[PDB]
Design a protein around this ligand. Structure first.
Ligand SMILES: Cc1cc2nc3c(=O)[nH]c(=O)nc-3n(C[C@H](O)[C@H](O)[C@H](O)COP(=O)(O)O)c2cc1C
Ligand SMILES: Cc1cc2nc3c(=O)[nH]c(=O)nc-3n(C[C@H](O)[C@H](O)[C@H](O)COP(=O)(O)O)c2cc1C
Lengths: 168, 167
């Protein structure tokens, strides 16, 4: 199972959330704040880039992917969407994908989720029904860890993604 | 008036339509295919980058903005969204903005526009009702131009955008 951090900010919240999960379930991880890609330019030479090849492969071999992203202007981050532009249905077709968006509070996160979900259907991923929106509340920034009340929520999400991975 | 090219592909179609517009109306132009930014990282140092400052400045000083993006996986380009991440409502507040998405297959185009409209509203831009979808068939890349069909549509769009500007 592969986890993916959407925030390009090393000091980002989504990073913490991504880390937690990747640790708890001992899952593979691609941290976009460390895994810096160039901006897609649609040329072939880019495909031969090593971080591009690595991304493509790690996604293909992934039995189930957890997609995390902050809400930047009522949408997923550009860092995330950029990486996705490098890939296609060739990697995502039928791929079990759980969505997770870190809002800044209120009713935020909905647009981000629908964005990710829409783009994910674009590449034919099997996006499970369960999706989560985490507010800064559920993020302990300094202690670099998640709140307790939302640890169950995530558990349910990961467990359900597993089930989907097994079926399809 | 400012035109922004969403496709990072130098050989991109969205780039042609963008150029056409910027030339036909002698507007300002930011071509993401050439104007290559780094991936946002929410760090202050990045803010002081010269391309970033020019981005903010050129957008703030625009009286209206034509936003073009190719549909990538039923969403705007990552290059375009990344650029947007550098900005905020501070440059977009009440900004008269027109939307354009380059996409093929009758079905496509709507998802990218809904994404552009949702995000633009996330920065309080004044997105006009008129938005277009340009099919690759209506764009001659080798000759670097758009079909005569499209020109009319684009005219109506630009003029409708200038109306908002004035208002
Ligand atoms: C460029 C940018 C745009 C933002 N716009 C939104 C927004 O659209 N909705 C929201 O809930 N939060 C927004 N915020 C606040 C973030 O959601 C908040 O920082 C959240 O914790 C994301 O954390 P992270 O990017 O550090 O992972 C934005 C933050 C940035 C940097
Ligand atoms: C990374 C990538 C993703 C794409 N995804 C879509 C999409 O989901 N919907 C669509 O209609 N076309 C899609 N296409 C085809 C584009 O619509 C087509 O290239 C269009 O002419 C955009 O031109 P441009 O990016 O060169 O400016 C995609 C193309 C690329 C390169």
């Amino acid at each position: 199972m592969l986890v993916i951090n959407g925030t390009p900010r090393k000091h980002g919240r989504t990073r913490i959330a991504a880390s937690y999960i990747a640790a708890l379930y001992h899952t593979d991880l691609i941290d976009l704040s460390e895994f810096v890609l160039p901006v897609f330019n649609g040329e072939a030479e880019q495909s031969e880039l090593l971080k591009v090849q690595e991304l493509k492969q790690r996604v293909t071999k992934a039995d189930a992917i957890v997609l995390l992203s902050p809400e930047y202007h009522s949408g997923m981050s550009g860092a995330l969407k950029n990486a996705l532009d490098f890939l296609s249905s060739e990697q995502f077709k039928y791929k079990p994908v759980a969505l997770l968006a870190v809002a800044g509070g209120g009713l935020g996160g909905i647009n981000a989720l629908n964005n990710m979900r829409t783009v994910m259907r674009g590449v034919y991923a099997n996006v499970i029904p369960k999706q989560l929106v985490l507010d800064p509340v559920h993020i302990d920034v300094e202690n670099a860890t998640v709140a307790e009340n939302i640890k169950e929520s995530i558990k349910e999400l990961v467990e359900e993604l597993s089930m989907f991975a097994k079926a399809g």
